[PDB]
């Protein structure tokens, strides 16, 4: 075989708790816990994951690590009249996934960029960590790049907030075609949010 080192990074991260990544995870969550919500990083933790998701080593491509709490939609008990069905909220998790929460927090932190994609990079009993790739549509490098210059279009702005990333489409139910996508494509709002 002649495999790339991206393949080895993939194998190492296939079962991370059974590889050296578990120990690295042990030292590394110590540093990550001390960090805040949204941290810029020089290089992706999983280079092969970043490159397959669209990361390139060029000007205007930023990579960030976002920390998100665990569990479901931390929800308030209603204080007025409700049905019994609508009174309970503890078991009500949201419809917004943790990955998309992290993507949207990164987008909020970086107003001038657009979220491309994100990937899981760690988690503990309280937090999950994601790495979000962002693109600068106003950088000349990105403008020249013909595989990324679609992001300079007026419709590519607000991708993470409008659900246009891969995680957003998965949460919208458009990851598949055919049966089960009757109330999801072309949009959740198009069918009165009855899908999902």
């Amino acid at each position: 075989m002649v495999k790339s080192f991206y393949g080895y990074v993939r194998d190492a991260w296939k079962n991370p708790d059974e590889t050296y990544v578990n120990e690295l995870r042990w030292e590394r969550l110590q540093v990550w816990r001390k960090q805040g919500s949204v941290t810029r990083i020089e290089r992706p933790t999983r280079i092969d994951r970043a490159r397959s998701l669209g990361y390139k080593a060029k000007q205007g491509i930023v990579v960030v690590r976002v920390n998100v709490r665990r569990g479901g939609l931390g929800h308030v008990r209603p204080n007025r009249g409700r049905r019994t069905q609508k009174m309970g909220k503890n078991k009500v998790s949201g419809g917004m996934s943790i990955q998309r929460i992290a993507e949207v927090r990164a987008d909020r932190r970086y107003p001038n960029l657009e979220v491309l994609n994100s990937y899981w990079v760690g988690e503990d009993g309280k937090h999950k960590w994601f790495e979000v790739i962002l693109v600068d549509p106003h950088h000349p490098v990105i403008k020249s790049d013909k595989n990324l210059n679609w992001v300079c279009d007026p419709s590519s702005r607000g991708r993470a907030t409008r659900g246009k990333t891969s995680a957003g489409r998965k949460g919208r139910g458009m990851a598949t075609r055919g049966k089960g996508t009757e109330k999801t494509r072309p949009s959740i709002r198009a069918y009165k949010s009855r899908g999902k």
Binding site: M1, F5, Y8, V9, A12, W13, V21, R43, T45, I47
Partner: protein
Amino acid sequence: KFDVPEELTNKALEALELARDTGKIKKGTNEATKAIERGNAKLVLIAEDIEPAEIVAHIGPLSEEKKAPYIFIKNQKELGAASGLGVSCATVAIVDAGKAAEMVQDIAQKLEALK
């Protein structure tokens, strides 16, 4: 593994210079991995200051699988310089030794001993 001697690492760097002069060097982690897998790697130099460590974590076990001598360099700036490159380099593989074949085999034997 005991710490490889400083003069031995400097001999490795000199061999890298001479392989630049005459032989063949694959600079970059993907190229070095391809060379080790193909079995063309006479010598492998791996930087120690790599972040994240996943980039060159596999190089050691791969070279010990394929019987390729490998050494660790203190950091990647002078490894890239020894590979004649304006950037850093996490690992290089001398695949053609030029007139540094004798010194490369000397480093290989010394690494085998120190292992």
